[PDB]
């Protein structure tokens, strides 16, 4: 295979990652294993998020993942939520939550 | 012979209905055009003769609404801690103090 | 055309709706003006930063990317408009 | 002109995980933003590590420890496993 | 005689707020740090300076947290900080969930 | 070990924080918060040390750990 | 030196070198080290100014951390600047809430 | 013996420039040095982010100024700008 992603068996563009690292003034030189490692990390995170996003879209009987789904997914998963704890999702909305003392007795 | 009306809701019920209603959707709550006018005014005072990409205004409004919703959540938390049910200005100030905002 | 008192364009029903999305049930009367003040502060800060970036860019028009940069500066990163 | 994006690769992954599920344009943009954000954070942390250790290059070790500093426990663990696996596969091939 | 309850506390507040010396005795804190550190890696060494930095950061953070907690308890019409106060403070901060 | 943070020491800290009346359960809750804070910071510091291939945790590592957590510290070679 | 030519006390060349080695950009222009050194020198002038003031108030000859903390926190703008910084041996500003005060 | 660096001496010269009859403690000296490092880092990083944001390769004086105006509060930033522009003009005056 020609593509480095195929060599590493990855869907993301390792070449693009390598360019980015080199065009970002993060260090004088970039190793050859870092683009692969970083691309794998990015792929893994994207897959993890997409799993929950698709599951949420299913729960709402929808063929397309829309921002509401992305929000729901992230905010329901403790770790993902912590990673994006200071991030805002356009059209995200919020998890449905009402404080107990506000419920009638 | 007259026309009689059935009944009247107890207070607070529609509050809860609204709460769930707006916690289910995501569409923006502040009306658009007043928001744009306010933003234009604020920028004007920072510098005159500026123009805006609509998308920029939309992003600004999204961030503003998100910030405000979180602020209200924290305010409600403070209100509850103060054994109350009506949020009151001092609750907002406490929230902003603890947040490290000024 | 001059702009004035546009802060009051943030009408009471809109603030009420937001507070509903925030989980608030009963709203004190004075909450509205305090909320107006808070919104004005937040907008002033974000627009100061965004205008700064635009000035450096030598552009007469504010671009979404400017807003996103400003927000990320404030530790309030936003997804959905690039970056 | 050319406006690069992770759209295609996100599509590939999605179909890999949910073949029968679409993504909206707004959702796609959000995903792209998330990708860029994580890239930037990891890269900055790795550069910081490189600097702290008076080192002039970024290797997969810097990326790995950066992930370990950035992501949470289980997320970091699986991400590390995936990264090392991809590195090994790339080296072998 | 006797000081009325609630007076010596004010004196101590004036006293401690005017000084900057650390308030946790070093050795128990250091032993706590080493215990905690051990659970991540075995056979580890610490520069005394590092321990001092850890103590500085920890005490400063605790003082800030208590400041916020007192603010909360005052808002709750109270004068005695209570666990729920710390929980609320940290929650609003975003540290606790 | 953890209990070595003596109740009166917690009182002293709070006093410096401006607290006047302290509850019993406070002490333990404070202990827990301190344990968590130390856990995070020391975790990051070790991580830094490990990448340095050193068996001795340095102050600088503590400094970078605090800086990551948005709790920057001064006075140890920032 | 170049600091001499710019009426600064801060080592411009040091700043220039650090700007290069810190991988902040591919190429570094000429004014930038000078400007950044000048801004840094101004800020530290302010910090020292207020800290010395405080030390005089406390009737001391050498500035100690407590003085720095006092100058920083008491001033509004410096305190905002150092919003996420804890100063070793700094302490806190004296402050007692009203309701806690004796009646 | 390793020849580690710091900002001490120049801090002392400035201090003399503002409070001639005054000293400083070693711990305060280190605190000052850390503060200088912090501010340097923040401004430089902001400059680099500008440079990336505008698709250009040079962190110039203009980048430094705009970063100063992003990072510092109003009055402090104003005076920062005045001082920096002054020193730059002087530096270009000489050679």
Give the CATH number of the domain where residue D51 resides.
Answer: 1.10.20.10
What residues of C are in contact with residue D33 (Cβ under 8 Å)?
78-83
d(CA H92, CA H95): 7
Cβ–Cβ below 8 Å for G65 and H48: no
Strand partners, G85: F72
Q: Strand, coil or helix: what is F22?
A: strand
Give the other-Cβ count within 10 Å of A6's Cβ.
13
Give the number of residues written for chain F.
Answer: 78
- Give how far the C-alpha of residue F66 lies from the chain's centroid of Cα atoms, to the nearest Å: 9
Core vs surface per residue G18-54: b (16+ CB within 10 A) or e: bbeebbbbeebbebbbbbbbbbbbbbbbbbbbbbbbb
Q: Token match 């004086």: residue?
A: H61
Check E71 against B98: CB less than 8 A apart: yes
The interface residues of chain A toward chain D in range 51-70, judged by CB-CB distance below 8 A, are: 51, 53-54, 57-58, 63-67, 69-70
Query: In terms of DSSP bridges, do strands G27-28 and G62-63 run parallel, antiparallel, or are they unpaired?
Result: unpaired
> What are the chain B neighbours of C47 within 8 Å (beta carbons)?
39, 42-43, 46, 60
What length does chain B have? 102
Q: Beta partners for D22?
A: A64
State how far the alpha carbon of A96 is from the alpha carbons of A52, A56, A76, C76, in Å. 17, 14, 11, 22
- Fold designation for E1-95: Histone, subunit A (1.10.20)
Q: Between chain F and chain D, are at least 3 CB pairs below 8 A?
A: yes
CB neighbour class for D22 (10 Å; exposed up to 12, middle 13-18, buried from 19): middle
A positions 1-60 inside 8 Å of D (CB): 1, 4, 7-14, 16-17, 20-21, 24, 26-31, 33-34, 36-51, 53-54, 57-58
Residue C64 with chain A: CB contacts under 8 Å: none
Which domain range does residue C23 map to?
1-83
Rounded distance, CA A61 to CA A54, Å? 10
User: What is the 3 state secondary structure string of chain H?
Assistant: CCCCCCCHHHHHHHHHHHCCCCEECHHHHHHHHHHHHHHHHHHHHHHHHHHHHCCCCEECHHHHHHHHHHHCCHHHHHHHHHHHHHHHHHHHHCC
E52 in contact with F, Cβ within 8 Å: yes
H23 phi and psi angles, rounded to 5 deg: -115, -170
Cα dist from D39 to A39, A41, C68, whole Å: 9, 9, 17
How would DSSP label each residue in B77-94? HHHHHTT-SEE-HHHHHH
Angle between the N-to-C axes of helices B54-81 and B89-98, in degrees from 0 to 180, rounded to the nearest 10:
100
DSSP line for F45-75: HHHHHHHHT-SEE-HHHHHHHHHHTT-EEES
Residues 6+ positions from F8 with CB-CB distance below 8 Å: none
What are the distances in angstroms from CA C11 to CA B69, C7, C15, E58, E85? 16, 9, 7, 45, 34
CA distances from B18 to B13, C23, C24, D65, E25 (A): 9, 10, 10, 47, 54
CA C56 to chain centre: 22
Interface test with B, best of C3, C7, C52 (most B CBs within 10 A): C3
CATH number at residue F6: 1.10.20.10
Phi, psi for D19 (deg, rounded to 5): -60, -30
Tell me the chain G residues in contact with residue A26 when contact means C-beta distances shorter than 8 Å: 23
* Resolution for this PDB entry, in angstroms: 2.9
* Among the listed residues B83, B85, B101, B84, the one whose alpha carbon sits nearest the alpha carbon of residue B93: B101
Q: Which of D9, D27, D67 is facing A11, going by the closest CB pair?
A: D9
Which of G54, G63, G85, G89 should we substitute to test contact with E (largest number of E Cβ atoms within 10 Å)? G89
SS3 of residue C43 by DSSP: helix
C57 contacts H64 by C-beta, under 8 angstroms = no
**Cα–Cα distance, H45 to A86 (Å, whole number):** 20
Gap between the Cα atoms of D10 and A43, Å rounded: 8
- Check CB contact under 8 Å for C23 and B19: yes
Task: Decide if C42 and B31 are in contact by the 8 Å CB cutoff.
Answer: no
Whether H33 sits inside 8 A of F77 (CB atoms) is: yes
Strand, coil or helix: D23: strand
Please report the sign of the dihedral spanned by the C-alpha atoms of residue E60, residue E61, residue E63, residue E67.
positive
Q: Which domains does chain A have, with CATH numbers?
A: 3-88 (1.10.20.10)
Rg (CA), chain G: 19
Q: Which two tokens stand for residue E11?
A: 């004196």
Domain span at residue H84 reads: 1-93
Residue D63's Cβ-count burial label (10 Å; 0-12, 13-18, 19+) is buried
- Ordered by start, the domain boundaries in chain B are 6-101
Q: Are H18 and G49 in contact (CB < 8 Å)?
A: yes
Chain B nearest CA to C54, separation (Å): 10
Calpha distance F9→F26 (Å, rounded): 12
CA distance C49 to C52: 5
Query: D65 near F47, Cβ under 8 Å?
Result: yes
Check CB contact of G85 with chain F, cutoff 8 Å: yes
| Cα G70 to Cα C45: distance, rounded to the nearest angstrom | 27
How was this structure determined? It was done by cryo-EM
With CB atoms and an 8 Å threshold, state whether D53 touches F51: yes
Domain total in chain C: 1
Q: Are D83 and D64 in contact (CB under 8 A)?
A: yes
**CATH class as words, domain B6-101:** mainly alpha
- Comparing CA positions, the residue from H20, H45, H74, H84 lying closest to residue G41 is H84
CA distances (Å), origin F12, targets A20, D15, D34, E5, F9: 52, 59, 45, 17, 5
Tally of domains in chain D: 1
Q: How far is D52 from chain C (nearest CA, A)?
A: 24
C11 contacts B35 by C-beta, under 8 angstroms: no
Length of chain G: 103
Containing H/E element for B95?
helix B89-98
Is F42 within 8 Å of chain D by CB? no
What is the C-alpha to C-alpha distance for residues B61 and E15, in angstroms, rounded to an integer? Answer: 49
For residues B70 and B54, the answer to whether their CB atoms sit within 8 Å is no
For A68, nearest residue in chain C (alpha carbons)? C80
Give the span between the Cα atoms of G11 and G33, in whole angstroms: 9
If phi > 0 it is left, if psi is from -120 to 50 it is alpha, else beta; for residue E6 that is left
Q: Which residue has the tokens 């404030």?
A: C74
CA–CA dist C77, B53 (Å, integer): 19
Q: Which of G40, G15, G42 is nearest to G29 (CA)?
A: G15
Residues H64, G36: C-beta atoms closer than 8 Å? yes
């Amino acid at each position: 295979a020609k593509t480095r992603s195929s060599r590493a068996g990855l869907q993301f563009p390792v070449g693009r990652v390598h360019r980015l690292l080199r065009k970002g003034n993060y260090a004088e030189r970039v190793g050859a294993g870092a683009p692969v490692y970083l691309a794998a990390v990015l792929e893994y995170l994207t897959a993890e998020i997409l799993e929950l996003a698709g599951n949420a879209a299913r729960d709402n009987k929808k063929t397309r993942i829309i921002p509401r789904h992305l929000q729901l997914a992230v905010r329901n998963d403790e770790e993902l939520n912590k990673l994006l704890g200071r991030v805002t999702i356009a059209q995200g909305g919020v998890l449905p939550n009402i404080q107990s003392v506000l419920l009638p007795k | 012979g007259g026309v009689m009306k059935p009944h009247r809701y107890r207070p607070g019920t529609v509050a809860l209905r609204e709460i769930r209603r707006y916690q289910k959707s995501t569409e923006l709550l502040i009306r658009k055009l007043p928001f744009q006018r306010l933003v234009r005014e604020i920028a004007q005072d920072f510098k005159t003769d500026l123009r805006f990409q609509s998308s920029a205004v939309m992003a600004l409004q999204e961030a503003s609404e998100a910030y405000l919703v979180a602020l209200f959540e924290d305010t409600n938390l403070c209100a509850i801690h103060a054994k109350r049910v009506t949020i009151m200005p001092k609750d907002i100030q406490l929230a902003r103090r603890i947040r490290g905002e000024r | 055309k001059v702009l004035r008192d546009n802060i009051q364009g943030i009408t009471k029903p809109a603030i009420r709706r937001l507070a509903r999305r925030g989980g608030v049930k009963r709203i004190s009367g004075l909450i509205y003006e305090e909320t107006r003040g808070v919104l004005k502060v937040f907008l002033e800060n974000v627009i100061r930063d965004a205008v700064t970036y635009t000035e450096h860019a030598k552009r007469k028009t504010v671009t979404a990317m400017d807003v996103v940069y400003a927000l990320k500066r404030q530790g309030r990163t936003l997804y959905g408009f690039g970056g | 002109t050319r406006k690069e994006s992770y759209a295609i690769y996100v599509y590939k992954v999605l179909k890999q995980v949910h073949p029968d599920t679409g993504i909206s344009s707004k959702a796609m943009s959000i995903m792209n933003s998330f990708v860029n954000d994580v890239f930037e954070r990891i890269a900055g942390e790795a550069s910081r590590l490189a600097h702290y250790n008076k080192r002039s290059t970024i290797t997969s070790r810097e990326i790995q420890t950066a992930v370990r500093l950035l992501l949470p426990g289980e997320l970091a663990k699986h991400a590390v496993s995936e990264g090392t696996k991809a590195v090994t596969k790339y080296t072998s091939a």
